[PDB]
Design an enzyme around this catalytic site. Structure first.
Site, PDB file in Angstrom:
ATOM      1  N   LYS A  37       0.847  -1.204   0.000  1.00  0.00           N
ATOM      2  CA  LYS A  37       0.000   0.000   0.000  1.00  0.00           C
ATOM      3  C   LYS A  37       0.879   1.249   0.000  1.00  0.00           C
ATOM      4  O   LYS A  37       2.060   1.175   0.321  1.00  0.00           O
ATOM      5  CB  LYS A  37      -0.921   0.034   1.240  1.00  0.00           C
ATOM      6  CG  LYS A  37      -0.204   0.126   2.593  1.00  0.00           C
ATOM      7  CD  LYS A  37      -0.904  -0.682   3.675  1.00  0.00           C
ATOM      8  CE  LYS A  37      -0.741   0.049   4.966  1.00  0.00           C
ATOM      9  NZ  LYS A  37      -0.745  -0.586   6.185  1.00  0.00           N
ATOM     10  N   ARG A 134      -9.933   0.113  14.978  1.00  0.00           N
ATOM     11  CA  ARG A 134      -9.974   0.747  13.667  1.00  0.00           C
ATOM     12  C   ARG A 134     -11.139   0.188  12.854  1.00  0.00           C
ATOM     13  O   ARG A 134     -12.221   0.774  12.808  1.00  0.00           O
ATOM     14  CB  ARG A 134      -8.648   0.493  12.947  1.00  0.00           C
ATOM     15  CG  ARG A 134      -8.406   1.321  11.707  1.00  0.00           C
ATOM     16  CD  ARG A 134      -6.929   1.332  11.367  1.00  0.00           C
ATOM     17  NE  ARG A 134      -6.424  -0.005  11.077  1.00  0.00           N
ATOM     18  CZ  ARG A 134      -5.184  -0.260  10.677  1.00  0.00           C
ATOM     19  NH1 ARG A 134      -4.315   0.729  10.526  1.00  0.00           N
ATOM     20  NH2 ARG A 134      -4.813  -1.505  10.419  1.00  0.00           N
ATOM     21  N   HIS A 164      -6.020  -7.362  13.344  1.00  0.00           N
ATOM     22  CA  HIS A 164      -4.770  -6.608  13.351  1.00  0.00           C
ATOM     23  C   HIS A 164      -4.369  -6.245  14.780  1.00  0.00           C
ATOM     24  O   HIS A 164      -5.213  -5.873  15.592  1.00  0.00           O
ATOM     25  CB  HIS A 164      -4.931  -5.334  12.512  1.00  0.00           C
ATOM     26  CG  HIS A 164      -3.634  -4.679  12.148  1.00  0.00           C
ATOM     27  ND1 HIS A 164      -2.668  -5.343  11.431  1.00  0.00           N
ATOM     28  CD2 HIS A 164      -3.200  -3.426  12.433  1.00  0.00           C
ATOM     29  CE1 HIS A 164      -1.672  -4.487  11.295  1.00  0.00           C
ATOM     30  NE2 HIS A 164      -1.946  -3.312  11.885  1.00  0.00           N
ATOM     31  N   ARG A 217       0.932 -10.981   6.878  1.00  0.00           N
ATOM     32  CA  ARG A 217       0.862  -9.734   6.110  1.00  0.00           C
ATOM     33  C   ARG A 217       2.161  -8.949   6.379  1.00  0.00           C
ATOM     34  O   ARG A 217       2.267  -8.166   7.326  1.00  0.00           O
ATOM     35  CB  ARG A 217      -0.385  -8.941   6.493  1.00  0.00           C
ATOM     36  CG  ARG A 217      -1.676  -9.735   6.307  1.00  0.00           C
ATOM     37  CD  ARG A 217      -2.934  -8.880   6.498  1.00  0.00           C
ATOM     38  NE  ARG A 217      -2.933  -8.167   7.776  1.00  0.00           N
ATOM     39  CZ  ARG A 217      -3.328  -8.691   8.934  1.00  0.00           C
ATOM     40  NH1 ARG A 217      -3.761  -9.945   8.994  1.00  0.00           N
ATOM     41  NH2 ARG A 217      -3.281  -7.960  10.040  1.00  0.00           N
ATOM     42  N   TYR A 263      15.124  32.189   4.129  1.00  0.00           N
ATOM     43  CA  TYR A 263      13.947  32.888   4.648  1.00  0.00           C
ATOM     44  C   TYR A 263      14.037  33.322   6.106  1.00  0.00           C
ATOM     45  O   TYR A 263      14.457  32.552   6.970  1.00  0.00           O
ATOM     46  CB  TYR A 263      12.694  32.026   4.443  1.00  0.00           C
ATOM     47  CG  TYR A 263      12.314  31.892   2.989  1.00  0.00           C
ATOM     48  CD1 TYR A 263      11.970  33.013   2.237  1.00  0.00           C
ATOM     49  CD2 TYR A 263      12.317  30.650   2.355  1.00  0.00           C
ATOM     50  CE1 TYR A 263      11.643  32.908   0.888  1.00  0.00           C
ATOM     51  CE2 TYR A 263      11.993  30.530   1.010  1.00  0.00           C
ATOM     52  CZ  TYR A 263      11.656  31.664   0.279  1.00  0.00           C
ATOM     53  OH  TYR A 263      11.343  31.563  -1.063  1.00  0.00           O
ATOM     54  N   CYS A 309      13.709  25.436   1.924  1.00  0.00           N
ATOM     55  CA  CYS A 309      12.734  26.001   1.001  1.00  0.00           C
ATOM     56  C   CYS A 309      11.920  24.904   0.334  1.00  0.00           C
ATOM     57  O   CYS A 309      12.174  23.716   0.538  1.00  0.00           O
ATOM     58  CB  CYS A 309      13.435  26.854  -0.059  1.00  0.00           C
ATOM     59  SG  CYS A 309      14.375  28.237   0.647  1.00  0.00           S
ATOM     60  N   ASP A 311      11.823  23.961  -2.780  1.00  0.00           N
ATOM     61  CA  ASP A 311      12.571  23.138  -3.738  1.00  0.00           C
ATOM     62  C   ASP A 311      14.058  23.095  -3.525  1.00  0.00           C
ATOM     63  O   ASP A 311      14.762  22.383  -4.251  1.00  0.00           O
ATOM     64  CB  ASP A 311      12.321  23.616  -5.169  1.00  0.00           C
ATOM     65  CG  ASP A 311      10.929  24.139  -5.371  1.00  0.00           C
ATOM     66  OD1 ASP A 311       9.978  23.327  -5.385  1.00  0.00           O
ATOM     67  OD2 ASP A 311      10.785  25.366  -5.515  1.00  0.00           O
TER      68      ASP A 311
HETATM   69  C1  LIG Z   1       8.537  30.007  -5.214  1.00  0.00           C
HETATM   70  C2  LIG Z   1       8.942  31.323  -5.758  1.00  0.00           C
HETATM   71  C3  LIG Z   1       8.158  32.465  -5.845  1.00  0.00           C
HETATM   72  C4  LIG Z   1       6.814  32.523  -5.366  1.00  0.00           C
HETATM   73  O1  LIG Z   1       6.798  32.986  -3.987  1.00  0.00           O
HETATM   74  P1  LIG Z   1       5.438  33.142  -3.123  1.00  0.00           P
HETATM   75  O2  LIG Z   1       5.993  33.383  -1.797  1.00  0.00           O
HETATM   76  O3  LIG Z   1       4.699  31.871  -3.196  1.00  0.00           O
HETATM   77  O4  LIG Z   1       4.769  34.270  -3.784  1.00  0.00           O
HETATM   78  C5  LIG Z   1       8.703  33.629  -6.321  1.00  0.00           C
HETATM   79  N1  LIG Z   1      10.033  33.713  -6.712  1.00  0.00           N
HETATM   80  C6  LIG Z   1      10.803  32.615  -6.547  1.00  0.00           C
HETATM   81  C7  LIG Z   1      12.295  32.702  -7.000  1.00  0.00           C
HETATM   82  C8  LIG Z   1      10.275  31.427  -6.066  1.00  0.00           C
HETATM   83  O5  LIG Z   1      11.172  30.361  -5.802  1.00  0.00           O
HETATM   84  C1  LIG Z   2      -0.379  -1.743   6.659  1.00  0.00           C
HETATM   85  C2  LIG Z   2      -0.840  -3.053   7.180  1.00  0.00           C
HETATM   86  C3  LIG Z   2       0.001  -4.091   7.479  1.00  0.00           C
HETATM   87  C4  LIG Z   2       1.453  -4.034   7.422  1.00  0.00           C
HETATM   88  O1  LIG Z   2       2.040  -3.607   8.717  1.00  0.00           O
HETATM   89  P1  LIG Z   2       3.574  -3.547   9.037  1.00  0.00           P
HETATM   90  O2  LIG Z   2       3.545  -2.988  10.404  1.00  0.00           O
HETATM   91  O3  LIG Z   2       4.210  -2.634   8.042  1.00  0.00           O
HETATM   92  O4  LIG Z   2       4.023  -4.966   8.954  1.00  0.00           O
HETATM   93  C5  LIG Z   2      -0.461  -5.301   7.954  1.00  0.00           C
HETATM   94  N1  LIG Z   2      -1.784  -5.554   8.135  1.00  0.00           N
HETATM   95  C6  LIG Z   2      -2.669  -4.548   7.854  1.00  0.00           C
HETATM   96  C7  LIG Z   2      -4.114  -4.719   8.198  1.00  0.00           C
HETATM   97  C8  LIG Z   2      -2.219  -3.292   7.387  1.00  0.00           C
HETATM   98  O5  LIG Z   2      -3.192  -2.307   7.266  1.00  0.00           O
END
Ligand SMILES: *Cc1c(COP(=O)(O)O)cnc(C)c1O
Ligand SMILES: *Cc1c(COP(=O)(O)O)cnc(C)c1O
Lengths: 379, 379
Positions: A37, A134, A164, A217, A263, A309, A311
């Site tokens: 999942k 759950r 579970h 599982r 920032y 930031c 990115d």
């Molecule tokens: C992401 C980005 C924006 C946009 O900024 P906002 O705070 O979302 O308005 C403007 N200029 C640069 C260089 C960005 O990286």
């Molecule tokens: C997600 C899930 C798992 C897997 O659990 P792990 O802790 O990652 O082994 C097993 N059984 C059910 C019902 C789940 O929802």
């Protein structure tokens, strides 16, 4: 193909070994159901599903219908069980795609019955709530009723039933036992034991392999991550971590003391420092909370300075390094290593959440047989 | 379509208005470049881009090359600027796709010049670092060298130059003023002025629309989110929040005093309580840190109980409610409302990070003219 120097690496050999070792530990009658999942916990759904099947798993499990249909579309033909809820009106869709559904309410069945009349049989897995709170049925009259509706419908088949555990990874086994014992008591509400009875997750199956019935599982451990640190010393075999994350320096500059970074200008260069910029930020799942965390660069730890930031983010370098130099956020570099467990610690969360958060923006490169096998770029 | 009852809704009307109001705010000679990086801040890249251009935007900006290529593929013909780094080898692909690139190093151009030789022109936007410490040139000689290399290559074109503010959102404009002045000083290092000079993000342009030169880079505010808390009352026009997140009860049940809920069994029902289960967890972006938060149900606040799971979480209900009852995680239900800022506060982060973390798993339903326009299910 991908055009930004930020990527995750997924070692399918590690996943292969984690599953094969479990296959080697379970009775030969016991099925391993690979839990895949959430895009295989952020590792790649089809790539992990395939490897797991090759290693000994015979079935797959997902969270909701869309995840199962996606596996079918990518060519997986093995059985798939939807662990969560679905719409009664979607039963026909799951039926003709050979997808098994989890059931826990008698009113769902009543509705499904009015909506479906064949021709494909539908395999249900009854969920019993033994203390997780759950999903699941909780009383006799409900279980009996669900079974009755199933038995009375020509295209409804009760293939299995499960529960579970809420505390299988805790060293203390008191609540576990209560749930186990509760399960044994509820199994008696059924006129006959369905072909598949399951209850164990990664922790329960690796701790108590003999009391796992006929299906396990397998989730978090398949990826090489311990269900919990308190259970690590109790693990039967060494788990091999599969996920790693890398980037490269896209800019390097020397800051003079008093100069600020990012920032809010919350970071000030105290001396002549070298600052490197890397193309990864919080829209990539590298959350802002990770400021102060250390990344690996040139075999050495370097702190993330200033606010992260969307990115990009900056690190204080050991010295002047060339652009293109590899930066490892999760993984190994020479003598030093950073594990997903190290990241979870800083984020004050559990390993489960980490790979899940590395977003669709980050491409996944797969390795198998010690060779690059495929690159998956969501965009 | 989607087969899980958890979805996000994006009101494209709100977005249209947020951009149109800016078009009226700025001098008619100043262009609006809509920033749609990170899949339009988690709102949907092509859907937001289209609306923004309809409202008055004439250009688009993304974080890296892959994002710009995806827009072109989805049918976007408008000019697109890649704000971050890119590979010199990829210069030809960008040129052929009409994608402007950000440049801030002379050694990058040295490399791209040898790999590219016509016939398409590459438009460059020189990035100057004036106090953010991220990307950008910082000295005169490097600035002149860059311009010179661009000058001698017949297909390299300097279309613009810009900078970025680190504190435009802080009420105190000390650092902002410093950066603005530095930008003006650095601008004199260029022999001639490129057609486009830009520096303003959402905060800077909403506060000082007269000091924006000829192009603005509108981001966060386009989505109806305030750049910062302190800047809120200083906003010229009212912002319309475009993002809401919803789900539905898939299971309802009554617990008896003493019964525990979720992983670790950290929650104990103290009295007879009705517990609801909804299909959304941390793999959906609803992080585990939201454990002590609440959701809206039937116009009332319902607290999340126990730990949040990967794909599901539980909440205490005001009483017996019917399965399928709508639950609102971010949005308004009657008199109550949960904004992204509320979620941001409990997650201890900024509003920017919230929509970006709602993962690929959650479908986006787009509304335009109060009608459902499209549904976007990434899986
Ligand atoms: C992401 C980005 C924006 C946009 O900024 P906002 O705070 O979302 O308005 C403007 N200029 C640069 C260089 C960005 O990286
Ligand atoms: C997600 C899930 C798992 C897997 O659990 P792990 O802790 O990652 O082994 C097993 N059984 C059910 C019902 C789940 O929802």
């Amino acid at each position: 193909d991908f055009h930004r120097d930020t990527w995750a690496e997924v070692d399918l050999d590690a996943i292969y070994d984690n599953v094969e070792n479990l296959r080697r530990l379970l009775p030969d009658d016991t099925h391993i159901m690979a839990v895949v999942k959430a895009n295989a916990y952020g590792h790649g759904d089809v790539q992990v599903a395939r490897t797991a099947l090759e290693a000994g798993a015979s079935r797959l499990a997902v969270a909701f219908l869309d995840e199962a249909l996606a596996l079918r579309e990518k060519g997986i033909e093995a059985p798939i069980l939807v662990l969560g809820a679905s719409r009664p009106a979607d039963a026909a869709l799951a039926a003709q795609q050979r997808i098994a559904l989890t059931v826990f309410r008698s009113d769902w069945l009543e509705e499904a019955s009015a909506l479906y009349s064949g021709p494909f049989p539908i395999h249900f897995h009854l969920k019993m709530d033994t203390g997780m709170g759950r999903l699941g049925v909780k009383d006799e009259e409900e279980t009996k009723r669900i079974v009755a509706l199933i038995e009375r419908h020509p295209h409804f088949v009760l293939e299995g039933l499960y529960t579970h555990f809420a505390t299988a990874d805790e060293v203390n086994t008191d609540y576990f036992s209560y749930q186990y014992t509760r399960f044994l008591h509820m199994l008696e509400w059924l006129p006959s034991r369905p072909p598949l009875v399951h209850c164990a997750n990664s922790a329960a199956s690796l701790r108590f392999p003999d009391r796992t019935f006929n299906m396990v599982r397998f989730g978090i451990a398949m990826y090489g991550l311990a269900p919990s640190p308190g259970i690590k010393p109790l693990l039967p075999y060494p788990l091999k971590e599969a996920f790693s994350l890398h980037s490269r320096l896209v800019h390097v500059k020397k800051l003079q003391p008093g100069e600020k970074v990012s920032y809010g200008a919350t970071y000030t260069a105290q001396t002549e420092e070298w600052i490197g910029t890397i193309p990864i930020g919080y829209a990539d799942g590298w959350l802002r909370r990770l400021q102060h965390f250390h990344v690996l660069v040139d075999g050495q730890k370097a702190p993330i300075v200033g606010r992260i930031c969307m990115d990009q983010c900056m690190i204080r370098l050991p010295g002047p390094l060339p652009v293109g130099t590899k930066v490892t956020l999760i993984g190994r570099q020479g003598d030093e290593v950073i594990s997903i467990d190290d990241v979870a610690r800083h984020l004050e969360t559990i390993n489960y959440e980490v790979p899940c958060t590395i977003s669709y923006r980050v491409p996944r490169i797969f390795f198998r047989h010690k060779r690059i096998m495929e690159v998956r770029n969501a965009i």
